[PDB]
Structure formats: C-alpha cells, structure tokens
Amino acid sequence: LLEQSPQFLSIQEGENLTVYCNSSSVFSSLQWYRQEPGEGPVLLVTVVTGGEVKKLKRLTFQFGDARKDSSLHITAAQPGDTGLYLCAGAIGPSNTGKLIFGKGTKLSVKPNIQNPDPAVYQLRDSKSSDKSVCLFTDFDSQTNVSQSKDSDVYITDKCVLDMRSMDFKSNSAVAWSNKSDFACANAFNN
Amino acid sequence: GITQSPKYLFRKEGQNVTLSCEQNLNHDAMYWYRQDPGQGLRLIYYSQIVNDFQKGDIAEGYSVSREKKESFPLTVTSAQANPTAFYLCASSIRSSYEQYFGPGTRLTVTEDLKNVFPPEVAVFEPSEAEISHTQKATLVCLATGFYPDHVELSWWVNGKEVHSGVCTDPQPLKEQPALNDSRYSLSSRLRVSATFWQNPRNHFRCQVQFYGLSENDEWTQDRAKPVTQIVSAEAWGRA
Amino acid sequence: MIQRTPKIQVYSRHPAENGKSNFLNCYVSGFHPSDIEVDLLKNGERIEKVEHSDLSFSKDWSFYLLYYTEFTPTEKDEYACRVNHVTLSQPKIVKWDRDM
Amino acid sequence: GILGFVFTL
Amino acid sequence: GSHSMRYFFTSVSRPGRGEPRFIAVGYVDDTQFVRFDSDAASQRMEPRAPWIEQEGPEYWDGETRKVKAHSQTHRVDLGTLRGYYNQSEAGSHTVQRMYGCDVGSDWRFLRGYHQYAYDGKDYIALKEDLRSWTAADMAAQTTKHKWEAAHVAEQLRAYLEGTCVEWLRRYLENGKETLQRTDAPKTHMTHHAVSDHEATLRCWALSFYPAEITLTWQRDGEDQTQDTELVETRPAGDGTFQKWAAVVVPSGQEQRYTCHVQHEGLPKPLTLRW
Structure with a gap:
C-alpha cells in the first residue's frame, strides 16, 4: 500500500509546503518524481536509509525512521514548482521486483501578479472578416475562469505566459463560438 | 538513455501494433505502463533480467519479449479491450530500484478511419485595444476539428521557432462531447511588444504538426486522405 | 581454476543382513568442479539403473552427491563404487567393506 | 520460498 | 532447538553444448524440500519432501517463475565474470550462490546468509550485519560498488530477516511431524x-x-x-x-x-x- 497526501495543495509563492508519502508496509527504497502529463516522469531523488535527509536546491526529502513514510519539503516555493509530484517505492516485505506508484500530489504555486490589468479583448482572423476570438488576459492569481455553462461557446482554462526578457508573466483564457452575434464583452460571465 | 519510438501511433481496431522501447543505460530491468487521462500509471508487464518477463496488474491483451538486454517490445493485440492510452517504458539498473522513464508513446485506436481529420489552423491578430492599453500584442492561434488528438503546435517568427511569450493549452478541447472519436481543438497564444507586432516586415506563423494516416494507408472515401501533415496559418505585422 | 578431490564412502543404508532388502550407497563429497562420473560396480560389473541426489554443496563450496541403488547382500558377492574426475589420474575404486 | 527479485553480478 | 532454511544454486557453463546447467535445491535444517533442474523435462520447481505438498498451485507457479529468473540471472553472471577475469569460451566455469536464514529456539530471527563463489572460491558475501559486503578480490569489488549504489543489501535484509523467517516458520509447522521430530x-x-x-x-x-x-x-x-x-x-x-x-x-x-x-x-x- 502507498498513499500520497494531500491530493492537492495551493500555495502562493514564498510560502513553504510539505507533501507526504506513506505505506502500511516498509520501503526498501523510495523515489520521488515530477511528472508532466504526456511526458515521462523525471526522477528527483531516491532515499534508502531510515531517518535520512537529502537536499536538492530548494527541495528537501526526508525519510521516516521505520521507512514507512517520506516527505517532500519545498522551502521558498516558486511558480515553476507547480506540477504533479509522484512518489514510488519498493516494498521490502513484498519480496517482488517491481515498484509501486502513488496517485501523485498536485501542487499549484500562484504567480505574484504585480499590476493586474484584467480585460477582455476581441481578436479578428488574419484571413477572413467574420471569424474572431475572445481573450481574457492580465488578471491576477485569485481569479479562476470557469468552464462554459454553454455548449455553443468554447472556453479554454488559464495558461500562464512568460515574456522572460521583460521579466513579465501574465494569465489568459481564450473563448470562441460559431455564432457571430456572440459577444466578447460578456463571454466570461461564468 | 531510454528511447520510445514512435511518439504517436494511430490504428483501427483489430490491428496489432508493437510499441518500441530501447535503452543503453546498461539496465537489467524494464517495465511497461499505460495511463489514461487524469489517472495514474498501471503496470502491464515487466522484465527483471534478459530472457525473463512477468505479468503486471493489467497484462490482458498485451504481449512482450526480452530477447535482448537493450530492448523490451510491447505488443497490443486485439484482445485488449481499451487499448487507447499513454504508454510509458522505464528501466532500472536492477529490478525494484529507481526507475528512469522513456518519453512515452501515445496510442489512439478508432473503430473507424472516417473519423480522421487534419487540423484547420487560424491566427487571430492582436487587439488594437490591447495595444493601446498595455503596449503589448497577443496573437492567438486556433487549431480546430482534428482527430486524433495527436498534434504538436509551435510558433515561428521570421522563420524561427520561438518559446518565450508562448502559452499553449495543456489539453485539447472536445468539439463534439458525445462520440468516442470526436474532433478536437487547441488554442495557443504568442505575446510580443506592440512595437514588434507593428513592424510590417515581421512574419508570424502558427504551425501544427498533425500525426495521421500513413501515405500508403488504404483510403476508401472521397475527400483527401488525412495523412500526417503540417498545417499552418500566418500573419504579417500591421502598422 | 581451483580443484578439490572427491572423498568417497561406500556403505549400506541399513545394517547389511544377508538375503534382506537394503540399499547400496556411494557418497562423493568435497570435490570441485561438479562434473563427475560415478559407477556402482558388482564384481567389477557396473550396475545399471543408478540413481543420485540433487547436486548440492557444503559451506566451503565443495560439491556432494549420494549415488544409490536398492540391493540385497550375498555373502560371496563384491560391491564397490568407481569414480572418474578431472582431479584424478584415472578412475579410482573403493570396495564395499560391509564393516565400514 | 525463494527471493522474488533478482540482480546481476 | 534451532532451525535454518537454505537455498543453494549452481550454474555451470557447458560451452558449445547448450547454455549453462542450472540446479537449485532448498533445505529446512537437514531435510531437502524443493529442487529445480534446467535439464529436467518438467521445467518446474518440484517437491522433494512430502509436507511441502501442502502448498497450493500458486506457490508452485510463483516458485517456478522466480527460480527461472534466478536461472537466467546466473547465466548472465557467467558471461560477466568471464570478462572480469579475461577467460575463454572453451573453459567451463561455475557460479555458486547460497542464501537463507537461521532462527533460534524461540523461532525468532538469529542470522542471515547470502554469498557467491566463482569456480569454487569465495566471490562476495553479505556480512552478518546484513549491511555490508565482503568482496574477495577487486572484481567482486566491482559487484560490490554496483550492489552498494543500487542498495541490494537493504532489500536482501527485508527478505532474510522477514520473508525468509516467515517461510521457515510456516514450513516448520506444516511439516512438524518430521521436521520437529x-x-x-x-x-x-x-x-x-x-x-x-x-x-x-x-x-x-x-x-x-x-x-x-x-x-x-x-x-x-x-x-x-x-x-x-x-x-x-x-x-x-x-x-x-x-x-x-x-x-x-x-x-x-x-x-x-x-x-x-x-x-x-x-x-x-x-x-x-x-
């Protein structure tokens, strides 16, 4: 058995967070991964000795005494630390040649938007007259865009965009529809 | 490292397909997993040592072999009921120690090739209101009506791919929520300075690599064969 | 390669009462490598249908094996075990004293 | 019962 | 009294004439209870004491799948060690492996063993603390470093002090009528x-x-x-x-x-x- 905790954790930058991994049995080794969906999980660390503590930059992994649990600590969280964190391990008592995997803790670190400038803009197709999309942009971390209440209207969720020359980050969602009466002004009521 | 080729795989039901997994890490143990959207890994098969292998938690419909240390091929047969998934290979120096993962392979299976469509692609030009208020310009790209959801969207400024100021939806959306093999759409945004967008000799291009039918696949219906192909839209800066 | 020479003991499972069913055993031990030909002989004649135990070994890694057959001792007939092995100049023969 | 995991020299 | 469970594995290269001979036996105290022979026709782990036949078909399937993995692992070991010593493909050679556990009168953990020999001389052995190795020579130090980096001993320790002892207890009580006699x-x-x-x-x-x-x-x-x-x-x-x-x-x-x-x-x- 292997459970991760909590399933989800929201943290605005600079705070510190500690996610957990536990077993009803005993691990002979335990791994922590980052995994981006659609890509292969990436190995952060292996721990093996009960009580041990390992550091990797801002990350600090600790292993319980009886090797039944483990923790990941991030000191001074950053918006790049956002993602799913996945715990795996070998169960000693099990006498097998495979690893067990957790369901992953998903961490969201909110970006510290300095001067929020929330607006909705209408954008026209570079090719035809009538086609257009709606862009909701420059809002802060505290705002969530809901899914469309409507099956006529498509709305993407947030994507954080980073112009890394101007040292500048901003949020945005896009909406569109096959109606032409359909208006940007209210597209994001939800 | 550990390779998995190809990154994308498309098939009709009944068609056996073999996924590849190679490694030169000098590892003895190899592992296969599959993952459905929003779910976790599921062990299919693994091998602790060359010339040996054993079933995982979901081996039905699957077949493997381990003739060589370097390779652990996985076959998905027509016995597997829900073959469409993300497939991940991993290796470890000895079994039951830290595993290193391959990049993964996406496999989509459809019960009929007439559901297959390449993307259409449109670039939407920055709002003049955005430019006035912020002195920044966001171009949005929209890829629509493609099936399967096997695409790579990228942005090209004056002939060169860019990554800064780009944000692409992590997930495609369903255009038709009801049916199994529905068409998809995907948006992305490129944000630049107003001054850059307002140069009329700056060329912007949204590019979608679509993975579809092979050139030599049987296409019985009238419209163009939805082969693997790149679909692009473009805009020039405007002053 | 390090090579150890086989030790040999020929003996019966039970005390050998004449005309009563017993077992003729030949125990080879302390040898390396494991490759070994072991022949039970009766009056210089190899008994067919020989039978040994599962190859195993002792703490010092040297191998051991129990070859055996079901026999019945008769006062005038000779029993022996015969062994060939790379550590031996030639086959070696150890005769069954029914007193050892 | 024997070891369930194997590992090379 | 005191009791032990031990397994013994012997792998011999028969160059040109097939691929190595593999023989495995298990003992409780001085009584053998299983065997596997890669030359025999059954390709199974087989019972050799009657009280092990109390084990069901899943016991047998597992043991057979595990012992076959052992078989290939020491096949590979033979090719590897021939490198580490620069030997020839005519020479027949031997890998030996033995492991198991001892328990006291209280039937609790006493001691554990896991060691190898190459051509009849010590190669590598887990020390009684079950944490460190004893490499005979430098070639085994190569194995030692790899086994240390991949933390073999720690997983071994879970089997020797745990699983191994659990099996022994079960075997001792199952076959009480001969084993404890x-x-x-x-x-x-x-x-x-x-x-x-x-x-x-x-x-x-x-x-x-x-x-x-x-x-x-x-x-x-x-x-x-x-x-x-x-x-x-x-x-x-x-x-x-x-x-x-x-x-x-x-x-x-x-x-x-x-x-x-x-x-x-x-x-x-x-x-x-x-």
Whole structure:
C-alpha cells in the first residue's frame, strides 16, 4: 500500500509546503518524481536509509525512521514548482521486483501578479472578416475562469505566459463560438 | 538513455501494433505502463533480467519479449479491450530500484478511419485595444476539428521557432462531447511588444504538426486522405 | 581454476543382513568442479539403473552427491563404487567393506 | 520460498 | 532447538553444448524440500519432501517463475565474470550462490546468509550485519560498488530477516511431524584384527536426525585423540544420518575404552564398550 497526501495543495509563492508519502508496509527504497502529463516522469531523488535527509536546491526529502513514510519539503516555493509530484517505492516485505506508484500530489504555486490589468479583448482572423476570438488576459492569481455553462461557446482554462526578457508573466483564457452575434464583452460571465 | 519510438501511433481496431522501447543505460530491468487521462500509471508487464518477463496488474491483451538486454517490445493485440492510452517504458539498473522513464508513446485506436481529420489552423491578430492599453500584442492561434488528438503546435517568427511569450493549452478541447472519436481543438497564444507586432516586415506563423494516416494507408472515401501533415496559418505585422 | 578431490564412502543404508532388502550407497563429497562420473560396480560389473541426489554443496563450496541403488547382500558377492574426475589420474575404486 | 527479485553480478 | 532454511544454486557453463546447467535445491535444517533442474523435462520447481505438498498451485507457479529468473540471472553472471577475469569460451566455469536464514529456539530471527563463489572460491558475501559486503578480490569489488549504489543489501535484509523467517516458520509447522521430530542414533561397536598386536574399535551411530552429533572416545580417564579417526557424517538415504569413529588399541586392552554419543535424540548420552 502507498498513499500520497494531500491530493492537492495551493500555495502562493514564498510560502513553504510539505507533501507526504506513506505505506502500511516498509520501503526498501523510495523515489520521488515530477511528472508532466504526456511526458515521462523525471526522477528527483531516491532515499534508502531510515531517518535520512537529502537536499536538492530548494527541495528537501526526508525519510521516516521505520521507512514507512517520506516527505517532500519545498522551502521558498516558486511558480515553476507547480506540477504533479509522484512518489514510488519498493516494498521490502513484498519480496517482488517491481515498484509501486502513488496517485501523485498536485501542487499549484500562484504567480505574484504585480499590476493586474484584467480585460477582455476581441481578436479578428488574419484571413477572413467574420471569424474572431475572445481573450481574457492580465488578471491576477485569485481569479479562476470557469468552464462554459454553454455548449455553443468554447472556453479554454488559464495558461500562464512568460515574456522572460521583460521579466513579465501574465494569465489568459481564450473563448470562441460559431455564432457571430456572440459577444466578447460578456463571454466570461461564468 | 531510454528511447520510445514512435511518439504517436494511430490504428483501427483489430490491428496489432508493437510499441518500441530501447535503452543503453546498461539496465537489467524494464517495465511497461499505460495511463489514461487524469489517472495514474498501471503496470502491464515487466522484465527483471534478459530472457525473463512477468505479468503486471493489467497484462490482458498485451504481449512482450526480452530477447535482448537493450530492448523490451510491447505488443497490443486485439484482445485488449481499451487499448487507447499513454504508454510509458522505464528501466532500472536492477529490478525494484529507481526507475528512469522513456518519453512515452501515445496510442489512439478508432473503430473507424472516417473519423480522421487534419487540423484547420487560424491566427487571430492582436487587439488594437490591447495595444493601446498595455503596449503589448497577443496573437492567438486556433487549431480546430482534428482527430486524433495527436498534434504538436509551435510558433515561428521570421522563420524561427520561438518559446518565450508562448502559452499553449495543456489539453485539447472536445468539439463534439458525445462520440468516442470526436474532433478536437487547441488554442495557443504568442505575446510580443506592440512595437514588434507593428513592424510590417515581421512574419508570424502558427504551425501544427498533425500525426495521421500513413501515405500508403488504404483510403476508401472521397475527400483527401488525412495523412500526417503540417498545417499552418500566418500573419504579417500591421502598422 | 581451483580443484578439490572427491572423498568417497561406500556403505549400506541399513545394517547389511544377508538375503534382506537394503540399499547400496556411494557418497562423493568435497570435490570441485561438479562434473563427475560415478559407477556402482558388482564384481567389477557396473550396475545399471543408478540413481543420485540433487547436486548440492557444503559451506566451503565443495560439491556432494549420494549415488544409490536398492540391493540385497550375498555373502560371496563384491560391491564397490568407481569414480572418474578431472582431479584424478584415472578412475579410482573403493570396495564395499560391509564393516565400514 | 525463494527471493522474488533478482540482480546481476 | 534451532532451525535454518537454505537455498543453494549452481550454474555451470557447458560451452558449445547448450547454455549453462542450472540446479537449485532448498533445505529446512537437514531435510531437502524443493529442487529445480534446467535439464529436467518438467521445467518446474518440484517437491522433494512430502509436507511441502501442502502448498497450493500458486506457490508452485510463483516458485517456478522466480527460480527461472534466478536461472537466467546466473547465466548472465557467467558471461560477466568471464570478462572480469579475461577467460575463454572453451573453459567451463561455475557460479555458486547460497542464501537463507537461521532462527533460534524461540523461532525468532538469529542470522542471515547470502554469498557467491566463482569456480569454487569465495566471490562476495553479505556480512552478518546484513549491511555490508565482503568482496574477495577487486572484481567482486566491482559487484560490490554496483550492489552498494543500487542498495541490494537493504532489500536482501527485508527478505532474510522477514520473508525468509516467515517461510521457515510456516514450513516448520506444516511439516512438524518430521521436521520437529528427533531420531536417536542406533549405536553399536565393532572389533577388528589390524596388526595382530593391535585392535580397531569402531563405534557406530545410525538412523539419527538431525545430522549434528558428537562421538567421543575415551579411556578409564579421558579422551583419546591419538590413533583415532572420524568419518564425515554421511546420509543414509532416507532422511537420517550415520557416522562412525575408530581407534587402534593394544590387544587385551580393548574393553577399557568407551565411546560417548551426544545428540538431542537422547536424554542422556550413551556409552559403549566392546
């Protein structure tokens, strides 16, 4: 058995967070991964000795005494630390040649938007007259865009965009529809 | 490292397909997993040592072999009921120690090739209101009506791919929520300075690599064969 | 390669009462490598249908094996075990004293 | 019962 | 008393003539209970004591799948070690492996073992602390570093102190009616006419289990070491053991010697004269 905790954790930058991994049995080794969906999980660390503590930059992994649990600590969280964190391990008592995997803790670190400038803009197709999309942009971390209440209207969720020359980050969602009466002004009521 | 080729795989039901997994890490143990959207890994098969292998938690419909240390091929047969998934290979120096993962392979299976469509692609030009208020310009790209959801969207400024100021939806959306093999759409945004967008000799291009039918696949219906192909839209800066 | 020479003991499972069913055993031990030909002989004649135990070994890694057959001792007939092995100049023969 | 995991020299 | 479970694996290269011979046996104390032979036709782990047949078909499937993995692992080991020592593809060579656990009277963990030999000489061995290795030479130090980096010992330790002991207990209680039984030796003495002057006194002990035993000679006073010999304890073929001890003596002095037989199949030891 292997459970991760909590399933989800929201943290605005600079705070510190500690996610957990536990077993009803005993691990002979335990791994922590980052995994981006659609890509292969990436190995952060292996721990093996009960009580041990390992550091990797801002990350600090600790292993319980009886090797039944483990923790990941991030000191001074950053918006790049956002993602799913996945715990795996070998169960000693099990006498097998495979690893067990957790369901992953998903961490969201909110970006510290300095001067929020929330607006909705209408954008026209570079090719035809009538086609257009709606862009909701420059809002802060505290705002969530809901899914469309409507099956006529498509709305993407947030994507954080980073112009890394101007040292500048901003949020945005896009909406569109096959109606032409359909208006940007209210597209994001939800 | 550990390779998995190809990154994308498309098939009709009944068609056996073999996924590849190679490694030169000098590892003895190899592992296969599959993952459905929003779910976790599921062990299919693994091998602790060359010339040996054993079933995982979901081996039905699957077949493997381990003739060589370097390779652990996985076959998905027509016995597997829900073959469409993300497939991940991993290796470890000895079994039951830290595993290193391959990049993964996406496999989509459809019960009929007439559901297959390449993307259409449109670039939407920055709002003049955005430019006035912020002195920044966001171009949005929209890829629509493609099936399967096997695409790579990228942005090209004056002939060169860019990554800064780009944000692409992590997930495609369903255009038709009801049916199994529905068409998809995907948006992305490129944000630049107003001054850059307002140069009329700056060329912007949204590019979608679509993975579809092979050139030599049987296409019985009238419209163009939805082969693997790149679909692009473009805009020039405007002053 | 390090090579150890086989030790040999020929003996019966039970005390050998004449005309009563017993077992003729030949125990080879302390040898390396494991490759070994072991022949039970009766009056210089190899008994067919020989039978040994599962190859195993002792703490010092040297191998051991129990070859055996079901026999019945008769006062005038000779029993022996015969062994060939790379550590031996030639086959070696150890005769069954029914007193050892 | 024997070891369930194997590992090379 | 005390009890042990041990497995023994032997892999031999038969160059050109197939790929290596693999033989595995398991023991509880001095009683063998399983075997696997890669040459036999069944391609299974097989029972060799009757009480292991209390195990169901999943036991057998598992053991067979595990022992086959052992088989390929030491096949590969043979190719590897031939490199580490620069040997030839004509030379036949041997990998030996032994592991298991000991438990005390309270049936709790005492000690664990895991070690290899190459061509009949120590290669590498887990030390009693179950944390560190003993590499005979440098080649094994190569294995040592790899096994250390991939933390072999820590997982081994979970099996030796845990799983291994759990199996042993189960085996001991399942086969209680033979395994936990004592067989007392069946003693008798023998006289021979070695150089006339001289007599050989041979003290026998038969059909005992376990194989552990002590046979001490003695005079009116104490032990007689000189002019004695002591046979290697040998198997009877039926799960019991035998061992004899001889002395040469001056004629007419025979009946003054006493053999002394120690074993846990007897309350008090037994004494013999001629």
